[PDB]
Design a protein around this ligand. Structure first.
Ligand SMILES: COc1cc(-c2ccnc(N)c2)ccc1Cl
Ligand SMILES: [Cl-]
Ligand SMILES: [Cl-]
Length: 329
């Protein structure tokens, strides 16, 4: 697109910030508001335009709801068509939580900073669960969470490119694999609870430095989830179109893993040991640090296991996650 280029006597393009499957994100000076903005420039192809039109609709819907809960979502300022590209103008944000982890050499941030991220994200998910919104993000991951300011720990969610309202599902195959919920792996109709699954995965990773469940494909993904959480309950597997991609049913009414050529036995890779609850935190690296006692760890573990409930019906919801003891001073 090229630095110094001027659009519509309003925006002066500075530089490329980001690239997506959707197109590209540039830093630009808005002469009207007299501020820098991020312009998301959608590719000029029907597929990308139509999905970006859904993104614009969902962001404008969120903007029509002024309440304290809405300020963890990136602000869409406006949109226009230019050179046959849909252009979405956002506020400028700082770097993303994956960059934050890369900056720790993938050793993770403190339980105290993890808590601050958890509280903001739970509040954002509470906002998206507003009945008249009922918005499923569908692609929550560290890269889609940006710092408001490189000096500060405030964050906002970006990229509603995959997002849909409850009952407006388009795709069966959604979410980034590492953050994909059991219900999506199993080909089942999904609801807002898939975002809470992603969040649980994200918070462990923010504190350990490493993805909780780093599957190389869907079969590997489900196997890595089963190592930590055991075989999913029969009532879920009995209703799951893709249950037999991963599992096999036996006369007893019971399920277990399909195996290929040579994972830890189901439920034996304990979150207790991944977090290092009794062993000084991840890799023992938090031994003796304040805010990293067994009691603080047990509360965190308890909240994560509620977020990683196999059953989307009983998986913790945002309001109840915010009332958890992990968040009590
Ligand atoms: C990579 O930097 C940004 C990216 C976005 C962004 C990127 C993709 N989708 C949405 N909705 C927003 C917005 C602001 C900034 Cl600074
Ligand atoms: Cl990642
Ligand atoms: Cl997706």
């Amino acid at each position: 697109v090229k630095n110094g280029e001027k659009w519509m006597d309003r925006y002066e393009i500075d530089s490329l910030i980001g690239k997506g499957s959707f197109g590209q994100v540039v830093k630009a000076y808005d002469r009207v508001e007299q501020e820098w903005v991020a312009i998301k420039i959608i590719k000029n192809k029907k597929a990308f335009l139509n999905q970006a039109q859904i993104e614009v609709r969902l962001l404008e819907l969120m903007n029509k709801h002024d309440t304290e809960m809405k300020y963890y979502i990136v602000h869409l300022k406006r949109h226009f068509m230019f050179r046959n590209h849909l252009c979405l103008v956002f506020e400028m944000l700082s770097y993303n939580l994956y960059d934050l982890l890369r900056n720790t050499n993938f050793r993770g941030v403190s339980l105290n900073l993890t808590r601050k991220f958890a509280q903001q994200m739970c509040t954002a998910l509470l906002f998206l669960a507003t009945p008249e919104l009922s918005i499923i993000h569908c692609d929550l991951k560290p890269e889609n969470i940006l710092l408001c300011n490189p000096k500060r720990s405030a964050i906002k969610i970006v990229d509603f490119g995959s997002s849909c309202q409850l009952g407006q599902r388009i795709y069966q195959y959604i979410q980034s694999r590492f953050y994909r919920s059991p219900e999506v792996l199993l080909g089942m109709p999904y609801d807002l609870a898939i975002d809470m699954w992603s969040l649980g995965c994200i918070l462990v990773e923010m504190h350990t430095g490493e993805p909780l469940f780093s599957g190389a494909n869907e079969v590997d993904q489900m196997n890595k989830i089963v190592e930590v959480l055991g075989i999913p309950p029969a009532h879920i597997l009995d209703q799951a179109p893709k249950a037999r991609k991963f599992f096999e049913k036996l006369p007893d009414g019971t399920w277990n893993l399909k195996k290929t050529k040579d994972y830890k036995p189901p439920g034996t890779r304990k979150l207790h040991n991944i977090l290092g609850v009794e062993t000084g935190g991840p890799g023992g690296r938090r031994a003796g640090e304040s805010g990293h006692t067994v009691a603080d760890y047990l509360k965190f573990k308890d909240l994560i296991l509620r977020m990683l409930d196999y059953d989307p019906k009983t998986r913790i919801q945002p309001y109840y996650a915010l009332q958890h003891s992990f968040f009590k001073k």
